[PDB]
Write a protein that binds this ligand. Structure first.
Ligand SMILES: *Cc1cc2c(nc3c(=O)[nH]c(=O)nc-3n2C[C@H](O)[C@H](O)[C@H](O)COP(=O)(O)OP(=O)(O)OC[C@H]2O[C@@H](n3cnc4c(N)ncnc43)[C@H](O)[C@@H]2O)c(*)c1C
Ligand SMILES: *[C@@H]1O[C@H](CO)[C@@H](O[C@@H]2O[C@H](CO)[C@@H](O)[C@H](O)[C@H]2NC(C)=O)[C@H](O)[C@H]1NC(C)=O
Ligand SMILES: *[C@@H]1O[C@H](CO)[C@@H](O[C@@H]2O[C@H](CO)[C@@H](O)[C@H](O)[C@H]2NC(C)=O)[C@H](O)[C@H]1NC(C)=O
Ligand SMILES: *[C@@H]1O[C@H](CO)[C@@H](O)[C@H](O)[C@H]1NC(C)=O
Ligand SMILES: *[C@@H]1O[C@H](CO)[C@@H](O)[C@H](O)[C@H]1NC(C)=O
Ligand SMILES: *[C@@H]1O[C@H](CO)[C@@H](O)[C@H](O)[C@H]1NC(C)=O
Ligand SMILES: O[C@@H]1[C@@H](O)[C@@H](O)OC[C@H]1O
Ligand SMILES: O[C@@H]1[C@@H](O)[C@H](O)OC[C@H]1O
Ligand SMILES: O[C@@H]1[C@@H](O)[C@H](O)OC[C@H]1O
Ligand SMILES: O[C@@H]1[C@@H](O)[C@H](O)OC[C@H]1O
Length: 473
């Protein structure tokens, strides 16, 4: 087709439709949501990225970058058939400056590779998600929360600059002192404004020791959930969680527990966690001290950590939702708990809920000023919890299945004003229509995002079904 011929004349490497690598390059993380690209550009340099983008523009097809391919909605494939996919997985180099400790990171680098390089070379790190296979591209541009986030913020917070290919093939570098509107827009909604061709990340010195731990919670009836969660949110909201502690509730039908990573040794953790244990009347378990990389492997849930192989093909079949909420009124706790016990526990599929200890007075995430970036959820009291709701089938996902997580989210949102909840596009939920998605993902920052979108991508070359709409002018 015309896109193929354009790329060929432009000397852009591609994955041919009839090649073995098509299947690999085109394959979603979420097997529920395969899409067939118009074509797959396989850039080795920013020049190839520029050329691919221009080809899409000239030919008249949409284009999207695919970094790690982990979009829960397969938005790196375009979220529908027929886009040019700019597959970035051949560009995964990580360079660490020994002086400045600034890492130059190619946009197809996955988190496990980045973490390995930074640690092996200079015992450095930045704050990012768990999951070695996740691409830095989608992850860092929309937030990126992990077991260092209470201590050190989101992945997006470690970006110091980015080189970007715009919709018309122009190159720009975005930073606090250059293209500051774009730098703002990138840092929360970056899928909408161009293809980031290179990141620079600041780093922190990796702590010599981190301690993972668990606290099993007796959340087996509604009253226990309500009282437990009620205590937990009050503790968090009142500054109970120290900066070194990073923690979440993981719940499934068969067990509920807090899971933490404490940036310090086991004796320091025990002392730090005691007030919570007394409050919940609970016990610590599985206390394990680690070096930095072993801490990362602990929550990685993956054999391979330093992943760079283009054959990468981990996939699951699932539906997922997210939320960001304030503290929950007890009426909402009750509805959410009743849903958990009476509905979620009975669902005959592998589901889980994660409630991240996200905000509160000690969180690095919510110490970032409200004007710093387009990422919306920075208020230490209003943005207290981040949630992942995940509903996985082994075999085809049932078409009536969505009502399960949909109903659960309704139990929260029925009792919260729209100023007290949002959603998180790193757990992209294609159940939301375009209008709702923009609103819930970006909330108070949507209007400025729409203005920058009209300025940088007025033709919506980088369209996907939950992309920011250009402001009308
Ligand atoms: C599969 C998976 C996802 C996880 C895991 N753990 C996470 C965690 O511990 N914390 C989190 O906050 N998130 C976690 N996630 C979710 C991932 O954070 C999101 O799914 C990321 O958005 C995925 O990033 P990536 O793998 O790069 O996904 P893509 O599908 O390639 O892209 C998503 C989105 O971003 C755009 N995009 C990619 N690359 C670029 C560049 N270079 N420039 C602009 N825009 C880019 C894509 O077009 C698409 O829109 C654990 C697991 C197992
Ligand atoms: C990432 O880094 C490696 C080197 O660390 C680059 O490898 C070079 O590749 C070129 C051809 O592409 C060869 O001529 C050199 O011999 C390679 N050097 C080494 C030391 O192996 C690689 O090009 C870089 N990849 C990207 C995508 O930028
Ligand atoms: C490519 O797009 C960029 C961004 O939309 C254009 O650069 C802008 O040009 C306008 C009009 O001159 C200026 O007001 C903006 O300040 C520019 N923005 C930036 C970030 O530089 C650029 O003109 C476009 N190039 C072409 C050939 O159309
Ligand atoms: C602490 O970290 C060091 C490396 O920094 C590691 O070698 C050691 O085993 C760790 N200690 C424990 C108890 O895990
Ligand atoms: C819930 O379970 C606890 C035991 O964990 C029990 O004491 C309590 O009475 C139960 N509450 C209800 C309402 O069933
Ligand atoms: C644990 O860390 C503290 C610092 O918070 C330090 O004083 C103490 O020596 C450490 N304990 C061990 C066994 O390394
Ligand atoms: O509610 C129950 C759930 O919690 C789990 O134990 O599996 C059986 C279900 O009936
Ligand atoms: O463990 C992972 C969790 O950290 C992330 O939030 O969502 C995906 C899970 O696999
Ligand atoms: O460098 C910053 C760090 O000091 C803070 O803790 O988290 C946000 C980062 O941008
Ligand atoms: O029906 C919707 C489905 O098409 C989408 O993939 O996931 C959300 C569902 O509500």
């Amino acid at each position: 087709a015309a896109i193929d011929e354009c790329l060929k004349n432009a000397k852009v490497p591609v994955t041919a439709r009839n090649s073995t690598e098509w299947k690999t390059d085109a394959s979603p993380f979420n097997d529920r949501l395969p899409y067939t690209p118009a074509a797959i550009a396989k850039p080795a340099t920013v020049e190839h990225i520029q050329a691919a983008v221009l080809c899409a523009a000239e030919v008249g097809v949409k284009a999207n970058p695919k970094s790690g391919g982990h979009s829960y909605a397969s938005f790196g494939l375009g979220g529908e058939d027929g886009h040019l996919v700019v597959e970035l997985d051949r560009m995964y180099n990580v360079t660490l400056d020994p002086e400045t400790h600034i890492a130059t990171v190619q946009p197809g680098a996955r988190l496990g590779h980045i973490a390995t390089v930074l640690y092996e070379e200079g015992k450095r790190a930045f704050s990012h998600g768990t999951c070695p296979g996740v691409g830095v591209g989608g992850h860092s541009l929309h937030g990126g929360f992990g077991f260092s986030s209470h201590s050190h913020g989101l992945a997006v917070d470690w970006i110091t600059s980015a080189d970007v290919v715009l919709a018309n093939g122009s190159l720009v570098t975005a930073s606090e002192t250059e293209n500051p509107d774009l730098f703002w827009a990138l840092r929360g909604a970056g899928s909408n404004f161009g293809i980031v061709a290179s990141f620079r990340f600041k780093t922190f010195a990796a702590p010599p020791n981190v301690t993972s731990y668990e606290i099993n919670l007796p959340w087996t009836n509604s009253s226990n959930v309500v009282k437990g969660w009620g205590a937990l949110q009050e503790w968090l909201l009142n500054g109970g969680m120290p900066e070194e502690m990073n923690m979440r509730v993981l719940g499934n039908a068969f067990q509920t527990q807090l899971q933490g990573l404490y940036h310090g040794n086991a004796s320091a953790l025990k002392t730090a966690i005691q007030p919570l244990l007394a409050l919940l009347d609970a016990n610590l378990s599985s206390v394990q001290e680690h070096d930095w990389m072993e801490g990362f492997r602990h929550y990685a849930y993956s054999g391979e950590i330093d992943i760079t192989d283009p054959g990468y093909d981990q996939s699951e079949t699932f539906y997922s939702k997210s939320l960001v909420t304030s503290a929950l009124p007890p009426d909402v706790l009750e509805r959410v708990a009743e849903y958990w016990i009476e509905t979620a526990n009975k669902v005959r599929r592998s589901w889980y809920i994660i409630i991240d200890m996200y905000g509160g007075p000690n969180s690095a995430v919510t110490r970032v000023p409200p004007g710093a970036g387009s990422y919306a959820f920075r208020d230490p009291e209003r943005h207290l919890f981040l949630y992942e709701l995940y509903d996985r089938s082994f075999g085809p996902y049932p078409d009536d299945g969505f009502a399960f997580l949909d109903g659960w989210v309704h139990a929260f949102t029925g009792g919260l004003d729209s100023s007290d909840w949002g959603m998180y596009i790193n757990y992209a939920d294609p159940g939301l229509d375009r209008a709702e998605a923009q609103e819930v993902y970006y909330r108070q920052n949507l209007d400025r995002l729409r203005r920058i979108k009209q300025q940088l991508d007025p033709t919506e070359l980088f369209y996907y079904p939950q992309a920011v709409e250009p402001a009308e002018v």
